[PDB]
Design a protein around this ligand. Structure first.
Ligand code: SIA
Ligand code: SLB
Length: 424
């Protein structure tokens, strides 16, 4: 139902033909100053940085009449945004500003909050915010998310994140508020809080609507702006074949991947503020869309890991498993085996996207070559092994495949796997 949603669209800031333009039909003027990077590939975002006098600035100047006839009753503002590195102690930055003469609206970030503000005058404002979960984001909330703010002078001001309502407040009397026709994208530090690291901000598809969109329409909009079958890396960018990742289990983000006697094991991270420990995997395609190197749901694939200059495949072992109390029926360890000339069945997996409001992840199923026989799901658990010279069995946290009726595990977060791109 996009046709009806789009009827009220009054600004549609998009990258078309390597140029930022308003495609809504109201012909807002758009200019760039400083360092503004345009992405030539989907999602065609623009990137701004915070440091230097030559930092990027994107200025949108709307038709003043469309503003006047739209903003004073009800409106919605939507856009995709990414911040790196959005650490929990971030100082204050205004990032998207529509304030002139001490009135208008503005969006800023501080600590773990993204804040939307109606500014009535120099002495009066009303704000709402999204705050990310710090305990689950020590490396920073550096992922793409979809913001939608809605306002109704006769009702509430709301902010949604990835299509989910996060904050709502009754709008107070804002008599005399004056909406500016100008919107300025630029990362501007607030000086009285009262030299930090540069941050980057990426933006794409910044829309404004002259109606208050409801939750249902916000989600339709959310989904219309993504390829939901393209699996995403941990920051929400397209997952790629032939590229190094840190593979993580959503239930164990504080663990990195290691290996011991060809058994993969999970060790506690020493650097909680980064993803920079342990071994990396590379995803290899068996079956998928050969037009690019993007990973899609339903693709058949396998995983490589290189240790001490030897390249292995992850594979489902065929040995009995032992656990302190749990039964281990149909549970098999995932370990590492030397590559061979031909793809062996026990290295073959099938991937599916598994996203939610706070994580981009996947589920990974044990598969045969043509995907006609899906026999299990990848999980994680603590089992008894003798590794690395051990005489006695010890407990290790290891990746596993659960076969038999794996359906019972489908809703478990233990089956959710993320892929963090390696910076170096
Ligand atoms: C020894 C060997 O032939 N290795 C080849 C492997 C194996 O065929 C598969 O990993 C199955 O083990 O496939 C590659 O595409 C890879 O994964 O990098 C190229 C590599 O040269
Ligand atoms: C493939 C594999 O498991 N390699 C592991 C090896 C083997 O355990 C060892 O060569 C045979 O026992 O030992 C390490 O180098 C080590 O403990 O320092 C870690 C490495 O990840």
């Amino acid at each position: 139902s996009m046709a009806n949603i789009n009827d009220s669209k009054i600004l549609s800031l998009q990258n078309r033909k390597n140029t930022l333009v308003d495609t809504s039909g109201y012909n807002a003027e758009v200019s760039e100053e400083g360092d503004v990077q345009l992405n030539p590939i989907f999602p065609f975002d623009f990137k701004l940085g915070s440091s230097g006098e030559d930092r990027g600035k994107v200025i949108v100047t709307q038709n003043e009449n469309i503003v006047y006839n739209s903003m004073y009753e009800s409106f919605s503002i939507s856009f995709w945004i990414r911040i790196n590195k959005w650490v929990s102690n971030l100082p204050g930055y205004t990032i998207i500003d529509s304030v002139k003469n001490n009135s208008g609206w503005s969006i800023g970030i501080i600590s773990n909050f993204l804040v939307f503000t109606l500014k009535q005058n120099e002495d009066s404002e009303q704000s709402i915010n999204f705050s990310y979960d710090i305990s689950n984001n020590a490396p920073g909330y550096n992922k793409w998310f979809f913001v939608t703010v809605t306002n109704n002078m006769m009702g509430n001001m709301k902010i949604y994140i990835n299509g989910k309502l996060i904050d709502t407040i009754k709008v107070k009397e804002l008599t005399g508020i004056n909406f500016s026709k100008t919107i300025t994208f630029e990362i501007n530090k607030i000086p009285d809080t009262g030299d930090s690291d540069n941050i980057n901000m990426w933006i794409r598809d910044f829309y404004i609507f002259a109606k208050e969109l409801d939750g249902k329409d916000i989600n339709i909009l959310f989904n219309s702006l993504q390829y939901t079958n393209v699996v995403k890396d941990y920051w929400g960018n397209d997952l790629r074949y032939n590229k190094e990742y840190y593979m993580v289990n959503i239930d164990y983000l504080n663990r990195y991947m290691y290996a011991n006697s060809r058994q993969i094991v999970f060790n506690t991270r020493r650097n909680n503020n980064d993803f920079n420990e342990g071994y990396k995997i590379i995803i290899k395609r068996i079956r998928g869309n050969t037009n690019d190197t993007r990973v899609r749901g339903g693709d058949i694939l396998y995983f490589d890991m290189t240790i001490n200059n030897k390249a292995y495949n992850l594979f489902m072992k065929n040995e009995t498993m032992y656990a302190d109390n749990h039964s281990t029926e149909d549970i098999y360890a995932i370990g590492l085996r030397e590559q061979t000339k031909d793809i062996n069945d026990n290295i073959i997996f099938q991937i599916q996207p598994m996203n939610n409001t706070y994580y981009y992840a996947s589920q990974i199923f044990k598969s045969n070559f043509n995907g006609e026989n899906i026999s299990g799901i990848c999980s994680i658990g603590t089992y008894r092994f003798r590794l690395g010279g051990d005489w006695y069995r010890h407990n290790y946290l290891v990746p596993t495949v659960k076969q038999g009726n794996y359906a019972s595990l489908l809703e478990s977060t233990s089956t959710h796997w993320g892929f963090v791109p390696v910076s170096e």
